[PDB]
Amino acid sequence: YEHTAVMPNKVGIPYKALVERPGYAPVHLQIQLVNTRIIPSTNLEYITCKYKTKVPSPVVKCCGATQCTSKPHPDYQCQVFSGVYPFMYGGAYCFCDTENTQMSEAYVERSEECSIDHAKAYKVHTGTVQAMVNITYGSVSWRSADVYVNGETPAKIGDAKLIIGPLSSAWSPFDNKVVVYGHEVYNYDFPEYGTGKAGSFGDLQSRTSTSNDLYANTNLKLQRPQAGIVHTPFTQVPSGFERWKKDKGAPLNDVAPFGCSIALEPLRAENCAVGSIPISIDIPDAAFTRISETPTVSDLECKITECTYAFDFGGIATVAYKSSKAGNCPIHSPSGVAVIKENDVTLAESGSFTFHFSTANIHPAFKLQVCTSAVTCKGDCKPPKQHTESFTSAISATAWSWIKVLVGGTSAFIVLGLIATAVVALVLFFHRH
Amino acid sequence: YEHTAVMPNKVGIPYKALVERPGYAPVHLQIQLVNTRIIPSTNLEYITCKYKTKVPSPVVKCCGATQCTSKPHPDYQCQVFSGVYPFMYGGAYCFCDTENTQMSEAYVERSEECSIDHAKAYKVHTGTVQAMVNITYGSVSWRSADVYVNGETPAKIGDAKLIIGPLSSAWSPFDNKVVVYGHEVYNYDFPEYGTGKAGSFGDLQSRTSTSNDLYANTNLKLQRPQAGIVHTPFTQVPSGFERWKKDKGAPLNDVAPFGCSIALEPLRAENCAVGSIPISIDIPDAAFTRISETPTVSDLECKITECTYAFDFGGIATVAYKSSKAGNCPIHSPSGVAVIKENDVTLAESGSFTFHFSTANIHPAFKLQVCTSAVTCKGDCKPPKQHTESFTSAISATAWSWIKVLVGGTSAFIVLGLIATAVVALVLFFHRH
Numbered sequence: 001y002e003h004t005a006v007m008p009n010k011v012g013i014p015y016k017a018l019v020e021r022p023g024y025a026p027v028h029l030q031i032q033l034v035n036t037r038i039i040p041s042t043n044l045e046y047i048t049c050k051y052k053t054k055v056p057s058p059v060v061k062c063c064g065a066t067q068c069t070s071k072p073h074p075d076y077q078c079q080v081f082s083g084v085y086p087f088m089y090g091g092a093y094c095f096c097d098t099e100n101t102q103m104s105e106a107y108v109e110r111s112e113e114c115s116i117d118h119a120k121a122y123k124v125h126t127g128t129v130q131a132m133v134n135i136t137y138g139s140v141s142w143r144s145a146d147v148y149v150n151g152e153t154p155a156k157i158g159d160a161k162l163i164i165g166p167l168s169s170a171w172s173p174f175d176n177k178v179v180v181y182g183h184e185v186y187n188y189d190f191p192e193y194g195t196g197k198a199g200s201f202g203d204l205q206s207r208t209s210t211s212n213d214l215y216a217n218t219n220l221k222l223q224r225p226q227a228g229i230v231h232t233p234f235t236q237v238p239s240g241f242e243r244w245k246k247d248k249g250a251p252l253n254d255v256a257p258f259g260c261s262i263a264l265e266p267l268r269a270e271n272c273a274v275g276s277i278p279i280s281i282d283i284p285d286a287a288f289t290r291i292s293e294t295p296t297v298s299d300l301e302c303k304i305t306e307c308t309y310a311f312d313f314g315g316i317a318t319v320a321y322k323s324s325k326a327g328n329c330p331i332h333s334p335s336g337v338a339v340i341k342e343n344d345v346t347l348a349e350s351g352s353f354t355f356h357f358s359t360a361n362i363h364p365a366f367k368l369q370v371c372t373s374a375v376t377c378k379g380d381c382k383p384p385k386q387h388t389e390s391f392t393s394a395i396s397a398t399a400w401s402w403i404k405v406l407v408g409g410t411s412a413f414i415v416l417g418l419i420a421t422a423v424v425a426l427v428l429f430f431h432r433h
Numbered sequence: 434y435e436h437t438a439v440m441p442n443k444v445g446i447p448y449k450a451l452v453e454r455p456g457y458a459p460v461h462l463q464i465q466l467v468n469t470r471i472i473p474s475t476n477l478e479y480i481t482c483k484y485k486t487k488v489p490s491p492v493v494k495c496c497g498a499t500q501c502t503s504k505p506h507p508d509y510q511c512q513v514f515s516g517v518y519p520f521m522y523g524g525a526y527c528f529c530d531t532e533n534t535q536m537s538e539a540y541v542e543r544s545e546e547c548s549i550d551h552a553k554a555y556k557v558h559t560g561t562v563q564a565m566v567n568i569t570y571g572s573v574s575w576r577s578a579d580v581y582v583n584g585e586t587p588a589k590i591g592d593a594k595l596i597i598g599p600l601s602s603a604w605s606p607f608d609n610k611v612v613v614y615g616h617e618v619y620n621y622d623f624p625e626y627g628t629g630k631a632g633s634f635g636d637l638q639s640r641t642s643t644s645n646d647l648y649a650n651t652n653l654k655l656q657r658p659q660a661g662i663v664h665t666p667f668t669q670v671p672s673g674f675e676r677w678k679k680d681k682g683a684p685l686n687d688v689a690p691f692g693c694s695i696a697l698e699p700l701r702a703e704n705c706a707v708g709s710i711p712i713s714i715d716i717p718d719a720a721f722t723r724i725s726e727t728p729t730v731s732d733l734e735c736k737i738t739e740c741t742y743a744f745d746f747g748g749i750a751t752v753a754y755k756s757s758k759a760g761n762c763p764i765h766s767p768s769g770v771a772v773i774k775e776n777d778v779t780l781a782e783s784g785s786f787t788f789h790f791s792t793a794n795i796h797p798a799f800k801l802q803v804c805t806s807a808v809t810c811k812g813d814c815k816p817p818k819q820h821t822e823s824f825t826s827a828i829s830a831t832a833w834s835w836i837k838v839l840v841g842g843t844s845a846f847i848v849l850g851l852i853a854t855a856v857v858a859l860v861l862f863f864h865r866h
Contacts, residue, residue: 041558043474125474125558153627194586 002161002282003029009036009167011271013388016343018332018369024288026372028330028343029137029281034144038269040127040174045191047121049114050239051204051218055232058103060084065100074214077106079222086228093228104232106220110204119181119241121191124174129167135160138287151278161282168275173256174267183264184251199240295347296324297370302377305354307364311386313341313356315364317377321351329371331355338366339388347371360389362397435594435715436462442469442600444704446821449776451765451802457721459805461763461776462570462714467577471702473560473607478624480554482547483672484637484651488665491536493517498533507647510539512655519661526661537665539653543637552614552674554624557607562600568593571720584711594715601708606689607700616697617684632673728780729757730803735810738787740797744819746774746789748797750810754784762804764788771799772821780804793822795830 003019014032021027059066068078084099129149135157136142147155149165156162179188192202196216205216223233253262260272299322307315315338330344341356359366364379381398396404436452447465454460492499501511517532562582568590569575580588582598589595612621625635629649638649656666686695693705732755740748748771763777774789792799797812814831829837 041474041476041556123474148626150626152625192585193581193583 001285001288002280004278004280006276007031007279008276009033010273011036016332016340018330018334019283021288023291025291025294025329027138027283027287028332029283030135030343031279031281032134034132034134036129036131036271036273037263037266038127038129038172038272039266040172040269041125042122042127042267045121045123045193046205046207047114047118047209048202048205048241049118050111050241051108052111053218053220053234053236054107054109055234056105056107058105058230058232059101060086060094060099060103060230061101062094062099063097066103068103068105073107075106075108075218075220077220077222079104081224084225084228086230088230095228102225104222104225104234106222106232106234108204108214108218108220110206110214117182119179119244122178122180124176124178126172129165133157133162137283140287149277159284163280164277167277171272171274173252173258173260173262173269173272178252180264180267184253185262185267186248186252197240199237199243201240201244203237203240291372294329294371295327297329297347297373298322298324300370300373300375302368302375304364304377304379307357307359307379307382308385309360309362309382309389310358311389313358314385315357315359315382316354317357317379318354319352319375319377321347321353323347323349323351325349331368331370333357333366333368335366336390337361337394338364340368345370358387358389360391361394434718434721435713437711437713439709440464440712441709442466443706444469449765449773451763451767452716454721456724458724458727458762460571460716460720461765462716463568463776464712464714465567467565467567469562469564469704469706470696470699471560471562471605471705472699473605473702474558475555475560475700478554478556478626479638479640480547480551480642481635481638481674482551483544483674484541485544486651486653486667486669487540487542488667489538489540491538491663491665492534493519493527493532493536493663494534495527495532496530499536501536501538506540508539508541508651508653510653510655512537514657517658517661519663521663528661535658537655537658537667539655539665539667541637541647541651541653543639543647550615552612552677555611555613557609557611559605562598566590566595570716573720582710592717596713597710600710604705604707606685606691606693606695606702606705611685613697613700617686618695618700619681619685630673632670632676634673634677636670636673724805727762727804728760730762730780730806731755731757733803733806733808735801735808737797737810737812740790740792740812740815741818742793742795742815742822743791744822746791747818748790748792748815749787750790750812751787752785752808752810754780754786756780756782756784758782764801764803766790766799766801768799769823770794770827771797773801778803791820791822793824794827 001019001021003017005017007015011033014030016028016030018026018028065080065082068080070076070078079102080100081102081104082098082100084102085093085095086099087093130146131149132144132146134142134144137160140158143158145155145157147153147162147164149167151163151165154161154163175187175189177189177191178185179191188201192205194205194215196202196205198217198219203216203218204214206214218236220236221234223235225231225233256262256269256272258272258274261270262268263270301320302317303319304315304317307317326348328344328346331340331342333340338357338359338361341358345353345355347353359382363381366379367374367376369375434452434454436450438450440448444466447463449461449463451459451461498513498515501513503509503511512535513533514535514537515531515533517535518526518528519532520526563579564582565577565579567575567577570593573591576591578588578590580586580595580597582600584596584598587594587596608620608622610622610624611618612624621634625638627638627648629635629638631650631652636649636651637647639647651669653669654667656668658664658666689695689702689705691705691707694703695701696703734753735750736752737748737750740750759781761777761779764773764775766773771790771792771794774791778786778788780786792815796814799812800807800809802808
């Protein structure tokens with residue numbers, strides 16, 4: 001036998017159902033979520049880090065001059081200078097005349113620490129949905145298994161079959177472009193493909209983790225050495241990666257709506273509570289029993305002792321009962337005005353017991369069924385003072401309803417009386433002739 | 434200096450442009466596509482192949498009976514039978530009484546040939562676009578390079594800079610789900626995630642290439658052995674993979690519109706001709722020259738010898754000319770009514786030469802410019818008899834235009850004459866008083 005329903009999506013709150021199979025004793029099942037792990041479909045774009053400039057040893061000549069050539073290197077540079085007359089330690093200083101020799105080539109490549117800290121850019125698409133569920137029905141204990149979310153993929157837990165999803169909404173917390181660094185992500189929605197920005201966020205963009213091309217600029221510039229001392233001055237913009245490190249905005253894990261964290265490795269967006277789920281479960285037929293083996297329940301009386309609406313179980317009521325024989329059978333509230341803390345209760349001859357429940361209404365009016373038997377427990381008013389409540393404009397109190405019906409009735413009475421008087425006046429004239 | 438335009442997308446047809454830089458001699462450039470390789474973004478779902486059933490050696494006993502247990506195997510089976518009294522070669526036949534012993538377990542797993550032929554399911558998203566271009570301008574020879582397609586990514590070819598794309602249309606030949614087998618693909622838009630179909634297309638669905646789970650059924654069934662001979666009969670549905678192999682529909686590479694083939698390895702959808710492209714190129718300023726170094730062109734006269742509109746170059750015309758000095762400078766037709774087969778021509782003093790061109794109009798009216806000088810060559814009518822033609826309702830012939838203007842003028846004349854006569858009649862009466 002199988003059963004279908006719709007369950008609101010929330011990680012903590014359980015769900016209690018009571019399946020009916022005519023000619024058999026009812027069975028109740030209890031299902032509770034543990035996770036909701038949205039997973040997107042992603043691909044890498046490139047990585048970036050802090051750069052480093054290196055310079056090979058320059059070359060000079062005691063006389064004459066040479067010319068430098070351009071080589072295929074990322075932001076390669078070379079240039080020549082004139083009239084050096086250099087100097088060395090206790091040396092002849094490598095000059096006798098106008099020198100006019102200087103190489104001063106410059107060279108850019110990735111840093112040695114790029115292997116550890118490095119932003120990554122990504123493109124994002126919808127991807128899959130999956131969760132995990134802990135289950136218990138009849139007398140079987142807690143059983144847990146995971147399952148995808150779509151109205152097609154079965155999964156067996158113990159001896160039951162499950163078909164859940166798809167979700168009621170297509171909402172997601174990600175955008176088309178994201179960036180991942182260190183431990184968290186950001187909606188830095190505008191990386192750049194091949195165009196750097198002279199050190200704003202892209203100035204060293206390795207297409208892969210160990211590529212050999214860095215299609216971005218650093219605005220490197222050379223300078224003329226002075227005072228005849230062998231060195232290679234230069235100048236360049238400071239790395240923009242540092243600047244973005246200093247001015248990162250709010251990380252996504254502190255702005256996501258609906259209160260859902262963000263794991264890293266699969267880009268899990270866990271627990272993001274929204275909407276409802278269509279559920280459909282089948283239980284084996286070996287867990288039912290003949291309807292003539294259960295104690296018949298009759299002569300019921302439910303009395304409300306004390307209650308108060310709060311996020312915890314703040315309601316207690318008692319029931320008096322006349323049994324057929326001793327046994328145990330479950331209890332449940334099909335209506336949603338109040339939730340029943342208890343699930344199943346034992347019964348003795350001439351039963352009389354109590355339970356617990358939460359609610360959200362001043363005057364609870366919930367009606368419960370037990371052991372194939374109905375009973376209304378209209379309760380009373382409860383004093384005022386995270387968990388399952390309705391809050392469906394059903395808080396109109398006795399005085400509130402009293403006043404509203406009073407004013408409506410008064411308005412109706414006066415208008416109808418006036419309408420009657422109009423035709424009362426008219427019919428006289430209609431009779432005068 | 435840089436130049437921008439829009440070019441129609443077609444693999445073969447080249448594109449000739451003539452950049453102008455005031456105070457300099459014009460330069461013409463020639464750009465020609467070689468490819469257009471749409472690439473989608475894809476991820477694997479599972480693979481499938483033909484299955485195979487194996488059976489371990491069954492166990493019997495000369496007396497008594499045993500019971501078989503269920504093991505965690507894909508579509509595991511076991512069962513027991515009664516009263517065997519089996520037989521063997523020249524043996525005692527392993528019986529003295531009612532045997533009632535039979536194991537006959539069955540077992541399903543992948544075939545040994547699954548490693549080679551196996552369908553794969555995929556999910557598809559937009560992905561990137563890229564192409565390759567062969568370039569030539571001024572006097573530089575043919576140069577070729579590839580480049581992505583977006584209005585952001587530069588690529589340098591020789592000494593020029595390129596920025597092309599994005600495309601004029603977002604059309605694609607793929608759907609959300611595709612299947613790849615052997616050499617080609619199909620829009621078999623409905624694979625199945627975890628639910629088999631007892632041998633229709635999914636009956637052995639390994640989540641990966643070498644997974645250890647096969648979440649699909651084959652409707653395996655056992656049978657009772659007869660005549661006391663040691664064997665394990667059974668029955669099952671034939672593999673549905675074979676059936677789909679026999680009844681594959683039209684492969685995609687024979688139904689794709691717009692005439693574009695399908696490579697395999699990256700799922701390239703090459704050459705799919707559609708729409709136009711915004712182009713923007715910059716040439717170095719070292720390829721211009723002062724406007725006072727080119728031969729001045731004056732006293733032009735263009736004469737059309739013979740032409741006929743066909744997909745090849747079927748038009749020839751001659752030009753007489755009076756030069757300033759010998760030299761070479763290009764020729765071009767800014768208008769699109771006709772295309773010029775030639776690109777640049779030499780000039781001698783008192784020039785007079787010819788060229789070739791295609792067209793698509795009965796009365797070509799194209800006007801060409803040469804060497805910083807304009808000339809109209811109104812041509813004449815050409816006799817009737819893959820390449821760049823307009824076909825823009827501009828085929829109205831001389832007789833056609835004659836008749837149309839005749840009928841329009843006649844209708845206008847008669848209606849206006851009648852309108853005039855109306856007020857002519859009216860004004861008389863307006864004058865009678």
